Amino acid sequence: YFQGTNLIVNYLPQNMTQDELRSLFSSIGEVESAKLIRDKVAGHSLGYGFVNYVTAKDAERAINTLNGLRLQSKTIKVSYARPS
């Protein structure tokens, strides 16, 4: 089974801010960094972000707890950020 600290969070609502993203994930455990991706020109969210936990165990708990969470008209996807 895969262990890691780094997550990608997809299908976030357009009005979710980086601070709200950080907060949601901070409820599980200590967050090393949370970054909401936005567009260059218009400042609008691209609807996804990266959340890295201090501990691997907390990233796993974040996936199990928050994957599939329904926010507004979106079902979010939380997974490990892995290459390919």
Side-chain angles (χ1 to χ4, degrees), residues 2-34 36-39 42-84:
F2 181 84
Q3 262 76 313
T5 55
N6 295 3
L7 302 178
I8 186 175
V9 185
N10 272 284
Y11 317 130
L12 300 168
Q14 276 291 302
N15 71 12
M16 190 179 226
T17 64
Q18 181 170 286
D19 288 323
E20 289 170 330
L21 178 64
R22 185 187 47 69
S23 291
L24 178 59
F25 285 84
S26 298
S27 65
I28 308 300
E30 181 67 356
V31 174
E32 167 71 35
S33 64
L36 182 72
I37 306 310
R38 299 188 162 272
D39 75 334
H44 292 67
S45 175
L46 292 177
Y48 73 99
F50 297 95
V51 173
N52 299 344
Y53 280 96
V54 172
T55 82
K57 275 286 297 190
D58 284 345
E60 177 177 5
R61 286 193 272 266
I63 293 173
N64 289 344
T65 300
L66 300 171
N67 187 46
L69 187 68
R70 200 190 291 273
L71 292 175
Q72 299 169 50
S73 64
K74 301 297 186 185
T75 297
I76 83 177
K77 187 177 186 174
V78 183
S79 53
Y80 292 113
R82 300 175 67 180
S84 274

